[PDB]
Amino acid sequence: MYQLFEELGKGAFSVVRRCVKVLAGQEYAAKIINTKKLSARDHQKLEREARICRLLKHPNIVRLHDSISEEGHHYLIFDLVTGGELFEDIVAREYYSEADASHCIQQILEAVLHCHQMGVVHRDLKPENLLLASKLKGAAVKLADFGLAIEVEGEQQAWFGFAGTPGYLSPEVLRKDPYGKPVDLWACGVILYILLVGYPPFWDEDQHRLYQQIKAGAYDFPSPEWDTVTPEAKDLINKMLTINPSKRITAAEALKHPWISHRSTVASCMHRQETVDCLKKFNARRKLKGAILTTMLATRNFSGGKSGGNKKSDGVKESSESTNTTIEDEDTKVRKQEIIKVTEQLIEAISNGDFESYTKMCDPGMTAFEPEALGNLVEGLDFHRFYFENLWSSKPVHTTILNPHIHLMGDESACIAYIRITQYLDAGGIPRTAQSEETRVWHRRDGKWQIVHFHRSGA
Amino acid sequence: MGDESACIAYIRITQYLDAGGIPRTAQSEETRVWHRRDGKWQIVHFHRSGA
Amino acid sequence: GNKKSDGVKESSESTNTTIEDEDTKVRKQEIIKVTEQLIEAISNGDFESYT
């Protein structure tokens, strides 16, 4: 059904690759999940992932087009978005301000609101899920990958499992409390914070200490970098990074926050180069750290790659191996002799009165000096046509070429000079003979020798 | 030479046949002096050589 | 070091395929140059330059 092309990204248990639907001629992203490496439970919950992704129809969410299982693999086929990560794109930009971060977060919150309205909680919102629609200027930010997403029943909270990414985990998930939609607003607070200053609000080498920080809500706004951030951006972060999920801002309420809805009078327009610089390092530290979880029930070293091949000529070119050797023309002929060949064909064409073959061997702008031109230079083949039509269209005539000399001037140019003697009969012969000295200037154009100029004397 | 006057000079070469050709060729040098009279070019004088 | 500005240029016997660069380089005039030098060499009776 589909044809797989380049890889676009990875997880521990999936890769994503561009693909083309064979019968459609439409391109898509294929999420290819190695089901042999999943738990029974995570394999089964692919049904839930497939279902959630079909439900979701929104301009800022990538949608599912198809789901296929084979013996060792499951395929979830989505829209292709080609802009890559928002976060990578931010660091390549010429200008980046609070007003620009507000537009990013608004798009994310719109997507999240739509999830929440459909009874979907993402649970694992992080920079990797934030993709750009295309490489065009001002492309939309799009949510991609809902592999840890859950379905909830109205506003009911439950214990859906300990799942997420350490830095973005909500306090309630870490306290083992029943949870729901607000987990995604905590993660948006963490993302917003990183969008403003380029580093996360909670970080520790020791994961247990990290979790105590999260549960305590122990983040800060240190000088110098937060000194130029507006109070309203800080207010929105505070409202999202509220420890008690019942008191945390919702996605609907966040979208009405002045830093978002009154962006044009509230959000700063100042370029934040330090954010761009910190975000580069953040982005780089994210790409060294493997997608691997803290631990699992297995003992296999990571392996596997995709090799190309190189295009090669078909058939049996030669017995011994030929690794791109400098091949030359095969043993066909000698170049002087080649000139002799086309020249003999020329003389035969003139003798037979065949203007058709004479035209092919002559350049359309052929130059000519001959006694029939009375000392003038003639261009073209119109002049010799009068002799092809009248005279040569026919008593016995024998030509004889004497003392031919050939000058080879590169692969594409040559010149031959010789003496032509013609034996003929005039009226009631009386056999006669005439001498002429002829020069032909040949030039190979598109693999064919053509006369560019010729000179004749005493005829 | 203005809107109403012009002059062209060229070499005329004629290929023909005499009696039982035997293709022949002849050269002449020709000058034509054109003049527009009432919106129409007309020859007022011409000169030929070697014909 | 030995970083001379006008470095010397020597090819082996190379193949010379046609080269249609978009810019209009001059060459016809070059032929006209060497030809005029030829005619002047013949006129002056300078067999040295003619050789």
Side-chain angles (χ1 to χ4, degrees):
Chain A
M1 271 267 47
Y2 293 91
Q3 181 160 25
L4 295 167
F5 288 102
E6 77 284 355
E7 185 171 306
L8 304 155
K10 273 181 157 165
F13 311 115
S14 72
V15 306
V16 184
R17 300 176 70 169
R18 186 174 73 84
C19 72
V20 180
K21 201 176 189 184
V22 162
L23 300 176
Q26 277 161 334
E27 61 180 1
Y28 291 100
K31 188 179 161 159
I32 309 173
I33 299 132
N34 189 176
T35 53
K36 295 179 178 179
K37 290 188 80 179
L38 295 183
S39 72
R41 187 182 189 271
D42 292 334
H43 187 179
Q44 190 53 42
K45 292 313 203 184
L46 285 181
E47 282 189 21
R48 167 173 69 184
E49 185 183 350
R51 184 169 60 242
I52 287 173
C53 294
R54 272 184 289 264
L55 244 195
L56 296 171
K57 302 179 69 187
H58 190 274
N60 301 103
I61 303 176
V62 170
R63 195 161 71 149
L64 189 87
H65 170 252
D66 207 1
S67 169
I68 300 156
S69 55
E70 285 178 338
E71 297 81 3
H73 289 265
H74 191 90
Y75 301 83
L76 290 175
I77 311 292
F78 299 90
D79 303 325
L80 187 59
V81 291
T82 62
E85 298 197 353
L86 175 56
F87 279 46
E88 300 291 333
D89 185 83
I90 290 172
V91 312
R93 294 179 184 188
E94 305 271 70
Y95 203 102
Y96 182 66
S97 65
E98 269 180 41
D100 298 303
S102 181
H103 179 56
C104 294
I105 216 61
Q106 176 172 343
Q107 296 181 84
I108 298 154
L109 290 160
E110 277 160 352
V112 165
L113 183 66
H114 176 82
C115 293
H116 292 178
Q117 286 166 341
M118 297 300 100
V120 167
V121 174
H122 189 277
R123 284 208 302 185
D124 194 27
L125 283 173
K126 62 200 177 293
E128 282 85 2
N129 303 105
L130 314 176
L131 299 191
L132 289 178
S134 70
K135 297 167 190 188
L136 302 173
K137 280 161 139 164
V141 175
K142 289 218 185 190
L143 265 49
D145 203 317
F146 287 72
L148 287 177
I150 58 154
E151 297 157 310
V152 296
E153 185 48 60
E155 308 311 320
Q156 300 175 53
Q157 308 299 280
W159 182 250
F160 293 101
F162 189 73
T165 304
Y168 305 89
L169 279 173
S170 52
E172 60 268 29
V173 173
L174 290 164
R175 292 186 297 254
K176 261 62 169 170
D177 280 349
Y179 64 89
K181 291 164 176 174
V183 307
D184 289 340
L185 278 122
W186 180 270
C188 288
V190 180
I191 294 157
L192 177 49
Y193 187 112
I194 301 168
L195 280 174
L196 286 196
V197 296
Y199 62 78
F202 317 103
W203 202 86
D204 204 295
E205 66 185 302
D206 191 350
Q207 200 180 253
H208 174 84
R209 291 201 273 138
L210 171 66
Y211 292 167
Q212 303 325 298
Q213 287 182 37
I214 291 165
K215 286 189 284 198
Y219 64 92
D220 207 348
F221 299 135
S223 304
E225 65 271 7
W226 281 98
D227 281 353
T228 60
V229 166
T230 59
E232 296 86 12
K234 296 175 172 167
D235 184 67
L236 186 50
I237 294 172
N238 288 339
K239 282 164 178 178
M240 285 170 155
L241 298 181
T242 279
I243 289 319
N244 184 343
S246 310
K247 298 179 180 183
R248 193 176 304 147
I249 200 167
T250 63
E253 289 168 340
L255 281 167
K256 289 162 186 138
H257 192 276
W259 189 78
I260 299 207
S261 59
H262 305 159
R263 170 189 306 146
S264 61
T265 59
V266 177
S268 178
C269 287
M270 177 206 98
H271 178 60
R272 305 188 61 75
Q273 188 61 46
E274 259 304 302
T275 301
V276 169
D277 290 340
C278 207
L279 213 54
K280 268 173 208 143
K281 293 199 177 52
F282 177 84
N283 290 340
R285 68 182 65 189
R286 286 193 294 116
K287 312 299 170 142
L288 306 178
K289 299 292 277 186
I292 194 171
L293 301 177
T294 68
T295 174
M296 61 180 300
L297 303 179
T299 311
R300 179 60 60 180
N301 302 0
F302 303 86
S303 302
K306 291 165 286 291
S307 195
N310 182 2
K311 62 180 301 180
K312 305 181 180 180
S313 169
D314 66 0
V316 47
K317 54 182 35 180
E318 202 262 1
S319 168
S320 315
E321 192 278 0
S322 61
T323 167
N324 308 0
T325 167
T326 307
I327 75 298
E328 293 177 350
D329 303 1
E330 72 180 0
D331 178 1
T332 73
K333 86 289 305 302
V334 65
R335 163 138 294 189
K336 288 202 178 193
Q337 180 80 39
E338 194 178 4
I339 293 303
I340 292 297
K341 177 75 172 182
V342 77
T343 310
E344 290 178 355
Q345 294 174 339
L346 175 76
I347 302 298
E348 190 173 355
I350 300 178
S351 180
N352 293 333
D354 181 28
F355 187 80
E356 310 171 356
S357 301
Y358 185 86
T359 305
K360 298 181 181 181
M361 293 173 297
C362 297
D363 185 90
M366 180 185 60
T367 309
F369 265 145
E370 64 176 0
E372 291 79 359
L374 300 174
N376 289 113
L377 188 102
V378 157
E379 190 172 6
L381 295 85
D382 196 349
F383 194 80
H384 319 81
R385 188 173 66 214
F386 182 86
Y387 303 102
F388 274 91
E389 290 171 347
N390 293 263
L391 164 67
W392 283 320
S393 289
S394 58
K395 293 183 178 180
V397 162
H398 186 36
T399 311
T400 302
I401 298 181
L402 293 184
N403 312 322
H405 288 58
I406 300 182
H407 288 281
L408 303 178
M409 300 163 292
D411 289 343
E412 50 178 349
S413 166
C415 167
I416 179 176
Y418 56 92
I419 292 178
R420 176 201 287 185
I421 293 184
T422 302
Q423 303 165 310
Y424 62 96
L425 301 159
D426 58 329
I430 312 294
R432 286 283 193 265
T433 170
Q435 180 179 352
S436 57
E437 303 82 49
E438 295 194 354
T439 294
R440 309 285 188 178
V441 184
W442 298 88
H443 179 18
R444 166 176 291 186
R445 297 182 179 179
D446 307 330
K448 181 177 180 59
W449 292 102
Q450 286 189 332
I451 307 173
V452 296
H453 168 59
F454 83 92
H455 203 330
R456 187 189 301 174
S457 290
Chain B
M1 300 163 292
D3 289 343
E4 50 178 349
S5 166
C7 167
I8 179 176
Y10 56 92
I11 292 178
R12 176 201 287 185
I13 293 184
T14 302
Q15 303 165 310
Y16 62 96
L17 301 159
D18 58 329
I22 312 294
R24 286 283 193 265
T25 170
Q27 180 179 352
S28 57
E29 303 82 49
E30 295 194 355
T31 295
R32 309 285 188 178
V33 184
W34 298 88
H35 179 18
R36 166 176 291 186
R37 297 182 179 179
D38 307 330
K40 181 177 180 59
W41 292 102
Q42 286 189 332
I43 307 173
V44 296
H45 168 59
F46 83 92
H47 203 330
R48 187 189 301 174
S49 290
Chain C
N2 298 355
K3 304 180 301 302
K4 183 173 43 59
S5 61
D6 58 358
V8 307
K9 303 298 181 300
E10 55 189 347
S11 198
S12 57
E13 296 175 344
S14 298
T15 76
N16 305 359
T17 168
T18 171
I19 303 298
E20 305 71 0
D21 294 350
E22 177 65 1
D23 57 358
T24 71
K25 306 181 181 63
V26 295
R27 163 138 294 189
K28 288 202 178 193
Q29 180 80 39
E30 194 178 4
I31 293 303
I32 292 297
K33 177 75 172 182
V34 77
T35 310
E36 290 178 355
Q37 294 174 339
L38 175 75
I39 302 298
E40 190 173 355
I42 300 178
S43 180
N44 293 333
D46 181 28
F47 187 80
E48 310 171 356
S49 302
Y50 185 86
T51 305

